[PDB]
């Protein structure tokens, strides 16, 4: 994908996160578990919902054939009528098909972007209090219990509060144990 | 019905149909396509 997240550096998705499109999996002393990100999933639903509505709305006026009859010596205008009417069915079919194809790509790329951005949200909260492992996961340099996890999930992680514990752990790791 | 075609009635909320272009009533918009489907979700794993 254009944003390299879905079926990219995050290889494959989670059958087990059922309550949203994007979210988190965590793992600590008290266990592990999945949790949807409500806010991103909601922005996405808003986007896609609006998109589907805009498509319906723009296709609202659009050519509507009407039947006209012509006698056997009005063949030139019967042909001009057929071609005019076929001409519009063709313009409109192209418009619908191409809009659908073009917007499908954008939609699929929109979600990809949404996962990248969420990953980056967590990345820039944690900074060097966690280590980027490369598969979509962060490994903390400090103990992070369920309360601390939620703080990551909801925008509230206090970096200063853990950084001391973080610097001690990074220290132990560089030194070799 | 609310929408009629020389080949039969249409009973649909959809924005498009491909039945026949000469309709009367409150109809969707005719296209020659066999298939039109929008993505809403995301790319589904392997």
């Amino acid at each position, epitope marked *: 994908g254009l944003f390299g997240a879905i079926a990219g550096f995050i290889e494959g998705g989670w059958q087990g996160m059922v309550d949203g499109w994007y979210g988190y999996h965590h793992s600590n002393e008290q266990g592990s578990g999945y949790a949807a990100d409500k806010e991103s999933t909601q922005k996405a639903i*808003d986007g896609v919902t609006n998109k589907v509505n805009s498509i319906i709305d723009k296709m609202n006026t659009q050519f509507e054939a009407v039947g006209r009859e012509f006698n056997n010596l009005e063949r030139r205008i019967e042909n001009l009528n057929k071609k005019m009417e076929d001409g519009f069915l063709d313009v409109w079919t192209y418009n619908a098909e191409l809009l659908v194809l073009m917007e499908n790509e954008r939609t699929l790329d929109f979600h990809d972007s949404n996962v990248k951005n969420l990953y980056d949200k967590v990345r820039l909260q944690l900074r060097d209090n966690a280590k980027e492992l490369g598969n979509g996961c962060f490994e903390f340099y400090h103990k992070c219990d369920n309360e601390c996890m939620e703080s990551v999930r909801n925008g509230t992680y206090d970096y200063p509060q853990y950084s001391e514990e973080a610097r001690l752990k990074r220290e132990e790791i560089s030194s070799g144990r | 019905t609310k929408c009629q075609t020389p080949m039969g009635a249409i009973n649909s909320s959809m924005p498009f149909h491909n039945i026949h272009p000469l309709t009367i009533g409150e109809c969707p918009k005719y296209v020659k396509s066999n298939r039109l489907v929008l993505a809403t979700g995301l790319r589904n794993s392997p």
Partner: antibody
Amino acid sequence: EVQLVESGAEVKKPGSSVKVSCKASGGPFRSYAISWVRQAPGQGPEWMGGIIPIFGTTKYAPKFQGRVTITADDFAGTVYMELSSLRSEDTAMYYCAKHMGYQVRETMDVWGKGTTVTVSS
Amino acid sequence: VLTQPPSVSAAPGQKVTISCSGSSSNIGNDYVSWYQQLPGTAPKLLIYDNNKRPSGIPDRFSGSKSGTSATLGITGLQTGDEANYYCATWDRTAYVVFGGGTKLT
């Protein structure tokens, strides 16, 4: 700004089915879930279940899991509720109510006026 | 199975309080919203997420979760406030549970 308008009163015999609808203004596709909540004469409200947009998934209450079906016609801006195996204690006012977002949740910020179903023999 | 006192009473101008109570698997973890019902009308959202208050609702209404139970408070109360009040919450199998209600006079 969103108006929820429901279908007319219904009168049913026990052991049959009713199917109420609810039309939401705007859209027609929505980014918020819709639920069905009922209220029996002299009783508090009971939540029946609701449906999530795009995902289409439904969530029902223990009390009804098994005889309620919630469905949507997103192009018409309409959700439906069908309750079968009716009994006289299903005689109640049936409200559709929308949530603030995509999840069905304790918070429903706009309600329909209500529609009555009477279950008598 | 969510506990609420059947009725509460007071005179035009005082501050009443309706409590609401249940186990860890509803109020302890999950949030509470409160609703107002006047005869002939659908319930009406008064407060949500424990203590937020939607537009249209005057700041004489409020609430909180003082433990595994939550309360609503009205102040400067008018004749219009004569109604039924219900707390709602989310209970983990999973459903929206309401309280029994409380007639306010």
